[PDB]
Design a protein around this ligand. Structure first.
Ligand SMILES: Cc1ncc(COP(=O)(O)O)c(CNc2cccc(C(=O)O)c2)c1O
Ligand SMILES: Cc1ncc(COP(=O)(O)O)c(CNc2cccc(C(=O)O)c2)c1O
Ligand code: NA
Ligand code: NA
Lengths: 402, 401
């Protein structure tokens, strides 16, 4: 009855193809598997462990709140939720927040809100949502239909309608499809899944202008790119384009299942009692942990450190390219890094990831052509050098015949 | 200072929370900011199935919390596989998927039923049959499968091919089902819908019709699962085995966690990348749910749920004898609904508020029904104390006459 990679196939729905090793312990930006093999973690569980594994402050918040109160339901409010809400409100454009459990749920709330606001303020026919090719917004039927990857939205029966997709960064295309029957434009300021592509300033400002013109709400999905990832608290702050609604998850709780939807009072008022809800959403345990996380991430020193560390990674990636000639582009913001493979290595991202893991380093992909890095925002310089040397080793092994 | 007014300044106006704010819980007692003590018969809507800060759950939280919280589903993890094995061993399930809420578990179940039909039968086999008054969550898809139009209206185009008929109306289901039907989705006991239990004939009938039409029978046990009814799952009480089952709430005793349970044959319809989750199935949630499962799935705890139900029922009967307020006491195990007599129709919220004033937390199940969903291990002493408080509350409401 030992637990092995084979056990996965016997137990879990076949929706994942997990690695051949099972991480069992983590500390900072290091992880150990069952055999005690050590890995440097540049993946962050896909940009989630923004303060690494078992950060003492987050462990302390978890344990202390864990002794006090976990859950009371939204029949009630609670102190950690209200404290966290205040912090988000003070630090951002938001005037009101709703807490949920996952990015998908935050997006569901955001999209329902944009829909309902249009229904109540303007017209029940103002239903069109504009989104972008390659977008990822979650796995619910509604959110995956707003997502821009048909491979993930096909095959589940009738999709919720009135969603139009155009290319990311194509402002003309957005102008062309938008009208007085449009309720929302939904965009990731950096498409994390779709090759780590950042919105251009003209594009993002243009979305703000078009939403103003058409009385549509601009929704920023900052599930991946928010909570310090870009080296600003939220990516919108880098761009200086303020959305109507913003969603946050992943880094928000440093690994704890939590998410948030942020908006203004005027927009929040379109919801009435019972318009939306959640059993677990905004429970005091999640909110205590996310509070601790927020308090660390939202400091000048940590935010500056994110840029320092980005350049430490970028310098290694450039050195790897000088030696092995494998990258055409190194992009992203802060500690969301994408490195696009040259045409010679098109479709090989998964192979470099696999070789990385063999070499003791966890990395990501962003589609089949792009390597992705989303380490802890406080990853130690020593871990960056050690892990990037392991990665350079993996690259060397892969390109040996080429 | 954090007050009730603070909520109005901070959270979307989707809730109208009580004027008091719980800050601490231990077992089935809760304290607010003023230090007022409450007996908890609400369980945060049937979630804290082992009460607040149960030592075993706190232990599991702390132990895993100092080890590993999250690695993403790029990897599996020991707690997820341990918990999966436990659920598989104890139920009809052969495979599971962990998610973060009941809504998410239902999303997974409904997408799976749809996808299984598409790949195993026909892309046109899309009809989902569900029931009036059903509650399945708040996502656009799940609220559309839910049977309360008030909650699904007003969000733009709903996902199509969902048909609603009355709960417990087997004839109506037979009438709407055909070869183009992919699923029948049902709560074995409708919790939010007045605490209405399925009849044996209705549930066994759904199984037969699903077999006839090659549709999947999906039990939403988010509320009635994980010991709530005095069996591990309500389907076990009924002896009707569904094709897919969803679980949340009690599963994590307060921790955000949920599960979708099915057979290998059905699970195999999904391919890699068909569904997924960032947080779903993380080792922390699974460690806590594992500890919860290990406690709830014992003969003693499950026997106790029935002893305790009768303790509640007897008090509710004593209250009706004194005050003439209840027409029916129903539900299963420690999901209890007490329907109000005609004279008190629509006033369940009045009794809930009087309850809170009197130091006892209770629920409603629509405007005509009082609902109780305490910890499955609630102490006899707390049942008596909370029920005497509730009796004082009823006395106060009746006295205004
Ligand atoms: C931009 C974005 N939006 C929404 C979600 C949905 O969040 P939840 O999973 O918590 O429901 C996500 C994250 N969802 C997700 C899941 C698996 C992989 C990846 C990846 O970026 O490779 C992303 C995301 O990255
Ligand atoms: C049968 C059922 N199905 C799905 C859900 C959705 O679960 P989540 O909330 O974890 O996403 C629920 C519970 N959802 C829920 C929320 C608020 C109130 C009530 C109530 O029964 O009064 C129920 C439920 O009771
Ligand atoms: Na603000
Ligand atoms: Na089994």
């Amino acid at each position: 009855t030992a637990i092995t990679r084979a056990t996965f196939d016997e137990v879990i729905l076949p929706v994942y193809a997990p690695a051949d090793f099972i991480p069992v312990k983590g500390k900072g930006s290091r992880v150990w598997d069952q055999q005690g093999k050590e890995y440097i973690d540049f993946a962050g569980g896909i940009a989630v462990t923004a303060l690494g594994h078992c950060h003492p402050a987050l462990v302390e918040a978890l344990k202390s709140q864990g002794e006090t109160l976990w859950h009371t339901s939204n029949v009630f409010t609670n102190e950690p939720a209200l404290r966290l809400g205040r912090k988000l409100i003070d630090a951002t454009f938001a005037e009101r927040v709703l807490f949920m459990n996952s990015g998908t749920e935050a997006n569901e709330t955001a999209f329902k809100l944009a829909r309902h606001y249009a229904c109540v303020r303007h017209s029940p026919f103002k239903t069109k949502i504009i989104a972008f090719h390659n977008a990822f917004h979650g796995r619910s039927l509604f959110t995956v239909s707003v997502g821009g990857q048909p491979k993930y939205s096909d095959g589940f029966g009738p999709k919720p309608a009135d969603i139009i997709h155009v290319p990311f960064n194509d402002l003309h295309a957005v102008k062309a499809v938008m009208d007085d029957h449009t309720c929302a434009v939904v965009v990731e300021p950096i498409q994390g899944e779709g090759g780590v592509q950042a919105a251009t300033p003209e594009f993002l400002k243009g979305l703000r202008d078009l939403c103003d013109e058409h009385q549509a709400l601009l929704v920023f999905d900052e599930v991946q790119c928010g909570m310090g990832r870009t080296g600003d608290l939220f990516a919108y702050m880098h761009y200086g384009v303020t959305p109507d609604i913003l969603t946050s998850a992943k880094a928000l709780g440093g690994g704890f299942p939590v998410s948030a939807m942020l908006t203004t009072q005027e927009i929040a008022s379109a919801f009435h009692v019972g318009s939306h809800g959640s059993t677990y959403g905004g429970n005091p345990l999640a909110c205590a942990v996310a509070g601790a996380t927020f308090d660390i991430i939202n400091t000048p020193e940590v935010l500056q450190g994110i840029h320092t560390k980005r350049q430490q990674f970028v310098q290694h990636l450039q050195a790897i390219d000088e030696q092995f000639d494998i990258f055409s582009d190194i992009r992203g913001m802060g500690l969301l890094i994408g490195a696009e493979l040259k045409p010679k290595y098109k479709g090989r991202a998964r192979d470099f990831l696999y070789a990385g893991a063999e070499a003791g380093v966890m990395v990501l992909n962003a589609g089949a052509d792009v390597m992705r890095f989303a380490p802890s925002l406080v990853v130690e310089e020593a871990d960056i050098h050690e892990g990037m040397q392991r990665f350079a080793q993996a690259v060397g092994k892969v390109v040996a015949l080429e």
